[PDB]
Design a protein around this motif. Structure first.
Motif, PDB file in Angstrom:
ATOM      1  N   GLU A  70       0.217  20.982  -3.035  1.00  0.00           N
ATOM      2  CA  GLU A  70       1.037  20.501  -1.902  1.00  0.00           C
ATOM      3  C   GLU A  70       1.674  19.313  -2.142  1.00  0.00           C
TER       4      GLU A  70
ATOM      5  N   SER B 253      -4.373  20.784  -2.665  1.00  0.00           N
ATOM      6  CA  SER B 253      -3.846  19.512  -2.360  1.00  0.00           C
ATOM      7  C   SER B 253      -2.892  18.891  -3.480  1.00  0.00           C
TER       8      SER B 253
ATOM      9  N   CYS C 224       1.597  10.323   0.663  1.00  0.00           N
ATOM     10  CA  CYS C 224       0.694  11.194   1.217  1.00  0.00           C
ATOM     11  C   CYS C 224      -0.199  10.857   1.903  1.00  0.00           C
TER      12      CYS C 224
ATOM     13  N   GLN D 132      -6.651  19.589   2.115  1.00  0.00           N
ATOM     14  CA  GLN D 132      -8.130  19.641   2.104  1.00  0.00           C
ATOM     15  C   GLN D 132      -8.825  20.488   2.997  1.00  0.00           C
TER      16      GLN D 132
ATOM     17  N   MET E 265      -9.582  19.073  -5.093  1.00  0.00           N
ATOM     18  CA  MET E 265      -8.097  18.645  -4.832  1.00  0.00           C
ATOM     19  C   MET E 265      -7.335  19.623  -5.449  1.00  0.00           C
TER      20      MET E 265
ATOM     21  N   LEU F  57      -2.491  16.708   3.042  1.00  0.00           N
ATOM     22  CA  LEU F  57      -2.885  17.602   1.829  1.00  0.00           C
ATOM     23  C   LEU F  57      -3.830  18.886   2.687  1.00  0.00           C
TER      24      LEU F  57
ATOM     25  N   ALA G 212      -1.290  23.423   6.685  1.00  0.00           N
ATOM     26  CA  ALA G 212      -0.777  22.278   5.949  1.00  0.00           C
ATOM     27  C   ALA G 212       0.612  22.207   5.764  1.00  0.00           C
TER      28      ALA G 212
END
Ligand SMILES: O=C(O)C/C(=C/C(=O)C(=O)O)C(=O)O
Ligand SMILES: O=C(O)C/C(=C/C(=O)C(=O)O)C(=O)O
Ligand SMILES: [Zn+2]
Ligand SMILES: [Zn+2]
Lengths: 342, 342
Positions: free
Chosen positions: B126, B123, B139, B114, B120, B112, B88
């Motif tokens: 990020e 995520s 996002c 994920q 989450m 993200l 990511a």
């Protein structure tokens, strides 16, 4: 010209049918044999049909419906073949009773005793039962008995070929149709149906079934799911994949109904899909039984949309009668035999 | 007027990026460490951009693209956290660089980290880096990190409330977006994509998320999937579910891009979706990269379709500039500080 609704289910049913299914499902869990099926009464069925489909048919000006079981109540994932054969058998037998009671108005189409863990062997037997015995004209084909995870092989797989061969033998099309959604992440009649339509289309796009079965005819409902809205998208992927054009690869064998519950959708369908590929249907008494606040007419009175198009009689004939009689040869015959000739 | 393309991924990459990712999956199988990440030159980035997206931005008359990592290649389904994170960042840091090297043309949206197994958690982390550290404006939010079987909570669940609260705080929308499919019977960019757009939208109509997060904005791409094509059906289902109208419930918070690769599809979206809810997008150099035999032009040159619509100049302004500057206030902000008012 006739007005033939190629898509319609027995959705508003007698009490005792939906009884036995629930208890039927019940003796499967309790590792029990199921109880006898209720012996419904002729006039119990008559009521439901007169109170619903037959009433709207009359008001909306149709001639017949091609009529199969409630699709949301098919539920192959519950359970194994043990539950799904006697269960498909019960539902088709009811479609058969409705045709016998109203054979001027309804033509039979059968669902399949498909189950996740099984092949098409029993589904073949039910289709031969319902075509050769009960006089049906086609079938509903579930490309994902698992109930909402598309965990089955594409329709281009040889898993399905034994079934395509008999479809070819009997000369009957299939309507690709999924059922209820035990994917908690998926609404059946809002998401699931529309997704399975596109996935099946994109599946055939990836192969060449109809090089193998040149007379195999499929119907994909809901105006083909999301396909016409994205027609250009699917044309460019045919290239991206290095495939034949859509008109060649699929559109002698794939057909789209007109269950698009608003004028602009029907407008787009007729704009982009050849006239020969477009079959009238509305599946009344189904996913959207309400009036449309914006048009003062019912969402699912789709004939109102086709009659709003600027199309010729030749085109209008094809949509309401022609295509469907060509797609269902067994129904064309029965009609010719009654002197109803195109 | 300003022409901003809200949907665009980095598809034609420096070669080391790709050679490495295959090794990181090669390592990960062989229970091996990852190989050192190849040092990549600004020019090796310039070349791919200069040769691809910027060359088409020029020819097509677009001022800037909202730019995020490649969709087909996110692939949260490979495999765990220790993959999804470094992958990511490696991708989001590339976007940050592209934005630097081309900061009048590319604004950054992040993918993200994920994973199927993960909440989450990362995520959320990020998102802070990419908006506070790296200066992003929104996002991409994958609704099916499993990558093919929709086995994830709906967008209505509380599982996503934490991260929804991070979006609200920082003030960043989310493009809902799925990635590569590992499911044979399903093709990523021509099926999975469209089905995921239509499911998410219906997941929302079944609930009331914006009652909890009244400023939460999503963008559903490919023109909302099957939704505008089937818009009457969705308005109908709102009544079937006893639900508020769709503009009340949804269409202050939910938006559609114009990634519909043919004129008729663009005609419809503009017919039935509020101008306020339509954001110009193209995803050039992505799913369908060829020309259309029927027009002479590219399938994915979506500006041409917005051009051919009969719509007012205001209405035209919203699609190319107005709506997306309202949907990305951090973009709105940056342009005003360059003197660029609406
Ligand atoms: O079961 C119901 O009442 C809903 C239903 C919907 C459909 O088939 C459809 O929208 O095409 C059905 O399964 O008949
Ligand atoms: O990766 C590719 O080549 C395909 C691709 C597709 C999309 O995002 C899309 O259709 O919207 C991408 O990841 O940019
Ligand atoms: Zn149906
Ligand atoms: Zn994309």
């Amino acid at each position: 010209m006739m007005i033939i609704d190629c898509h319609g289910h027995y959705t508003v049913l007698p009490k005792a049918h939906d009884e036995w299914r629930e208890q039927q499902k019940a003796a499967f869990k309790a590792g029990q044999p199921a109880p006898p099926y209720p012996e419904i009464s002729d006039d119990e069925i008559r009521e439901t049909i007169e109170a619903n489909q037959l009433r709207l048919i009359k008001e909306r000006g149709a001639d017949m419906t091609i009529f199969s079981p409630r699709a949301s109540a098919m539920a192959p994932h519950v359970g194994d073949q043990s539950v799904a054969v006697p269960w498909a058998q019960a539902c088709n037998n009811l479609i058969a009773r409705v045709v016998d009671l109203f054979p001027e108005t309804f033509a039979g189409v059968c669902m399949l005793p498909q189950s996740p863990e099984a092949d098409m062997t029993s589904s073949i037997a039910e289709l031969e039962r319902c075509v050769n015995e009960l006089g049906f004209i086609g079938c509903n084909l579930n490309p994902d008995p698992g109930g909402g995870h598309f965990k089955h092989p594409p329709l281009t797989d040889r898993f399905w070929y034994p079934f395509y061969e008999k479809m070819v033998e009997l000369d009957v099309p299939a309507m690709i149709h999924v059922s209820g959604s035990c994917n908690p992440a998926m609404h059946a009649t809002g998401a699931y149906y529309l997704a399975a339509d596109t996935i099946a289309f994109m599946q055939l796009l990836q192969g060449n079934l109809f090089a193998d079965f040149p007379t195999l005819r499929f119907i994909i409902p809901h105006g083909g799911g999301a396909v016409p809205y994205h027609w250009g998208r699917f044309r460019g992927l045919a290239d991206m994949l290095k495939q034949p054009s859509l008109d060649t690869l699929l559109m002698n064998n794939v057909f789209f109904d007109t269950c698009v519950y608003h004028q602009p959708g029907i407008n787009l369908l007729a704009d982009v899909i050849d006239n020969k590929n477009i079959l009238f249907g509305s599946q009344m008494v189904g996913a959207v039984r309400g009036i449309d606040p914006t048009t003062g007419h019912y969402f699912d009175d789709t004939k109102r949309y086709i009659d709003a198009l600027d199309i010729s009689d030749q085109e209008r004939h094809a949509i309401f009668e022609g295509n469907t009689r060509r797609v269902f040869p067994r129904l064309d015959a029965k009609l010719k035999a009654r002197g109803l000739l195109e």
